[PDB]
Amino acid sequence: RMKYRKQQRGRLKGATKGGDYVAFGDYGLVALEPAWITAQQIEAARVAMVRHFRRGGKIFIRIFPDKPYTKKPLEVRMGKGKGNVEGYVAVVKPGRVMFEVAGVTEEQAMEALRIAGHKLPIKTKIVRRDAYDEAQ
Amino acid sequence: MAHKKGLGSTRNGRDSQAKRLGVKRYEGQVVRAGNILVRQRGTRFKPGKNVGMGRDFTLFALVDGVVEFQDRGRLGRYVHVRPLA
Amino acid sequence: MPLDVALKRKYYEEVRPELIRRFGYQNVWEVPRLEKVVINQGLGEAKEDARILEKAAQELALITGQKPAVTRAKKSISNFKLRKGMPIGLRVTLRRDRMWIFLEKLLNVALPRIRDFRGLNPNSFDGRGNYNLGLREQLIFPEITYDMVDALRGMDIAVVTTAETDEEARALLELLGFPFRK
Amino acid sequence: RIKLLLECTECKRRNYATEKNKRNTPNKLELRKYCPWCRKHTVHREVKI
RNA sequence: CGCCUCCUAAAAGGUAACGGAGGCGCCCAAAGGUCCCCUCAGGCGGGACGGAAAUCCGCCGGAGAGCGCAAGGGUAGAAGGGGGCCUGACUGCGAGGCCUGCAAGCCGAGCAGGGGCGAAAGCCGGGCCUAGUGAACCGGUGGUCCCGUGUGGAAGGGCCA
C-alpha cells in the first residue's frame, strides 16, 4: 500500500459516487458496487496481475491507499479517543476507473483481472476503451 | 487473576466558546446610529457612507439611515446608511 | 586630479556621439550611455567591529565620500542558516559626475595596478549591459598606506547604465573604459 | 513580580491618576505626563510607586 | 474540569461526544498618537571578503513573504517597512445596538472640559483585531474633608482612586 507521509490521523464514513471512467491503456478493471478497499487487497490484485503477466511488462494503477481505518482498541470496551491507526485503503464507490496494463493482449489480461478482483472485494466489471475523451 | 477491561483515556481536551458577528441587519429595515449591523472579524466590509467601523471591525450605524446594502460588487462589500426620509 | 576629471568628461562626451552614430542611427540616445554608480563591499561580517569597521570607514571615505563605524555582525552569519535582520548595509550610491571622475580615476587610472592585475574577464557585465566587475583586491594605494594589515579587499561596484543589450553596452565601456580580454 | 510590576501616576501634589504599567526595559525612568483633574488638565507628572 | 482559534453547527445563528486538533493565565515603557516617506518572499541573470543562504547591480511577481505570541479572519486601496514631532494607554460621558434568561462581557457617533500630529480637510478617550481573566465578603494604602451615637475634637468610621 501507499498513503505515505500523510498529514492527519483519521477520516470518517459515508459513500455514494465519484469520478473514475476514462481508459488509460485499454486493459481495464472497473469497480461498480464498492466503497473503501484495503490498500492490501489492492496489492493483492497488483500481485495477481503482475504475476500472471509472464511476470514483467508493467500494469498501471488506479485508486490509492487513501484513508486510515480504525477498530481502535484491540477488543476492549468502547470510549478510546477512538485513536489508533490501523488499516489503510481506497475509497472508490461508483463503478470506478481502475486502470491496469502489461501487454497481455487478451482474455489473458482478462484472467489476470478475473482473479485479481473476483478476489478484491465487490460486484464489479471490466473492459477496454469505449468512447475516448477530449480535454483542452 | 482478574480480566476486566483495561485503562484507555488518551485525551482530546478541545474547546471554543460560542460566538457571534456576521451579516446581522436586514435590508432596508429602519437603521439608526448606535444600532449595530454587521460585525466582521476581517474586512469583508468597507464602512461606506454613515457606516462606522468600530475599534473592532464592527459595522455600526453612524446615522439614521434606511438599511443600505451596498455590495459594491467586486470592490468588495460596502455598507451604507441612507439619509432617513 | 580635476585633471582626469576634465578627462572622463571628454573621453565619454566625444566617444559617445562617436560610436553613437557609428552604429546606432536611433537618435543619439542612451544608445548606449552610463548613469549613476553604486559601489558595494565585503559585508560587515567581515567585521572586528570597531577595528576593521572603522577601516571600512577610512576606505569608503577617501575612495568616494562615506566612511564606516562600529557594527558588523548582527543576527550573525552565525552557523549556516542562522541570521536575523541585516544591519550591515555598507555601500555608496553616489549618483553622477563624482561617479564620472570616478569611471576615470578608477577604471582608466587604477585598473591595472597590483599583483598580476591584468584583466582577461569574459562577459564583464552581460546581465543586461549595466556593470559587472568588482575586483577582489583594493586599488591598494588608491590613497592610504598601512592603515590596517588586511584592511580591505572584497571590493565590488556597479553602474546604472542604459547600454541596453550587451554587444551595445560593450561598445560603451569597451572603448570608454577598456574591455578586459576575450 | 515578574519584570511586570504595577505602578501608577500622581501629579504635583494636586491629584493622582492610576493605570499599572510594567518594569522591564528602561525600569525606573518614570516621569511621563497624563493630566489630573487638577485645574483644567495640567502636567500631572506620573511617577508615584 | 477557565479562555482564544479550526473541524463536526449539516450552509442563518446556533448544539453534545472519554469526538478531532492546538495555543494562553505574557506584555509591548514604547509594536501606545499623528504627520511625512517607503513598499514583500520568492524566480531568474550578473557580480568583493562570496561562495546551498549574506551585500550590491540588472530584470520578473491575486502580494503565497508580513503583523511578539496558536489558530482563524483579515488584510501591503499595508493593519506592513523607515523618519519627525507627542501623550487621550484623557476625566465627565454617552444616544443607541452585538450576544445573554441571571450577571456578565462587548460595539460606539456625538456634547463638555483638555490637551497633541498637520497649516489645515481631521485622527487620538492604547495597541491590527478574536484568549493575557475572577463576584462577594474581609482588610490596606493615596484621598476626601460626608458621618460621629449630649458638644468641641477623636478612636472609629460613609463615597472616590
From Swiss-Prot, chain A:
GO biological process terms held by the UniProt record: translation
Protein keywords: Ribonucleoprotein, Ribosomal protein, RNA-binding, rRNA-binding, tRNA-binding
Keyword Magnesium: no
A GO CC term attached to the entry: cytosolic large ribosomal subunit
Keyword Oxidoreductase: no
InterPro entries on file: Ribosomal_uL16 (IPR047873), Ribosomal_uL16_bact-type (IPR000114), Ribosomal_uL16_dom (IPR016180), Ribosomal_uL16_sf (IPR036920)
One term of GO molecular function: tRNA binding
Function: This protein binds directly to 23S rRNA. Interacts with the A site tRNA.
Recorded family membership: Belongs to the universal ribosomal protein uL16 family.
UniProt-listed PANTHER family: 50S/60S RIBOSOMAL PROTEIN L16, LARGE RIBOSOMAL SUBUNIT PROTEIN UL16M
Record note on quaternary structure: Part of the 50S ribosomal subunit.
Name by which UniProt lists this protein: Large ribosomal subunit protein uL16
Curated annotation (Swiss-Prot), chain B:
Keywords of the record: Ribonucleoprotein, Ribosomal protein
InterPro entries tied to this protein: Ribosomal_bL27, Ribosomal_bL27_CS
GO cellular component entries: cytosolic large ribosomal subunit
GO BP annotations listed: translation
Stretch list, region Disordered: 1-21
Any one GO MF annotation of this record: structural constituent of ribosome
Gene3D superfamilies attached to this UniProt entry: 2.40.50.100
Entry function: Found on the solvent side of the large subunit.
UniProt xrefs under PANTHER family: LARGE RIBOSOMAL SUBUNIT PROTEIN BL27M (PTHR15893:SF0), RIBOSOMAL PROTEIN L27 (PTHR15893)
Quaternary organization: Part of the 50S ribosomal subunit.
Family: Belongs to the bacterial ribosomal protein bL27 family.
Name of the protein: Large ribosomal subunit protein bL27
Record organism: Thermus thermophilus (strain ATCC 27634 / DSM 579 / HB8)
Lineage summary: Bacteria, Thermotogati, Deinococcota, Deinococci, Thermales
From Swiss-Prot, chain C:
Listed GO MF terms: rRNA binding; structural constituent of ribosome; tRNA binding
Biological-process GO terms, alphabetical: translation
Entry coiled-coil feature ranges: none
Superkingdom of the organism of origin: Bacteria
Keywords: Ribonucleoprotein, Ribosomal protein, RNA-binding, rRNA-binding, tRNA-binding
UniProt xrefs under Pfam families: Ribosomal_L5 (PF00281), Ribosomal_L5_C (PF00673)
Cellular component per GO, a single term: ribosome
Gene3D superfamilies for the chain: 3.30.1440.10
Family: Belongs to the universal ribosomal protein uL5 family.
Function as written in the Swiss-Prot or TrEMBL entry: This is one of the proteins that bind and probably mediate the attachment of the 5S RNA into the large ribosomal subunit, where it forms part of the central protuberance. In the 70S ribosome it contacts protein S13 of the 30S subunit (forming bridge B1b) connecting the head of the 30S subunit to the top of the 50S subunit. The bridge itself contacts the P site tRNA and is implicated in movement during ribosome translocation.
The protein's assembly and partners: Part of the 50S ribosomal subunit; part of the 5S rRNA/uL5/uL18/bL25 (TL7) subcomplex; has also been isolated as a complex with 5S rRNA, bL25 (TL7) and DNA binding protein II. Forms a bridge to the 30S subunit in the 70S ribosome, contacting protein uS13; this bridge is straddled by the 5S rRNA. Contacts the P site tRNA.
Record protein name field: Large ribosomal subunit protein uL5
Species per Swiss-Prot/TrEMBL record: Thermus thermophilus (strain ATCC 27634 / DSM 579 / HB8)
Organism phylogeny: Bacteria, Thermotogati, Deinococcota, Deinococci, Thermales
Gene, per the UniProt record: rplE
Curated annotation (Swiss-Prot), chain D:
GO biological process: translation
Domain of life: Bacteria
Single GO molecular function: structural constituent of ribosome
SUPFAM superfamilies membership: Zn-binding ribosomal proteins
Cellular component GO terms held in the UniProt record: cytoplasm; ribonucleoprotein complex; ribosome
InterPro entries: Ribosomal_bL33, Ribosomal_bL33_CS, Ribosomal_bL33_sf, Ribosomal_zn-bd
Keywords per UniProt: Ribonucleoprotein, Ribosomal protein
Regions crossing the membrane: none
Record-linked HAMAP family: Ribosomal_bL33 (MF_00294)
Family assignment from sequence similarity: Belongs to the bacterial ribosomal protein bL33 family.
This protein's name: Large ribosomal subunit protein bL33
The organism of origin for this protein: Thermus thermophilus (strain ATCC BAA-163 / DSM 7039 / HB27)
Upper taxonomic lineage: Bacteria, Thermotogati, Deinococcota, Deinococci, Thermales
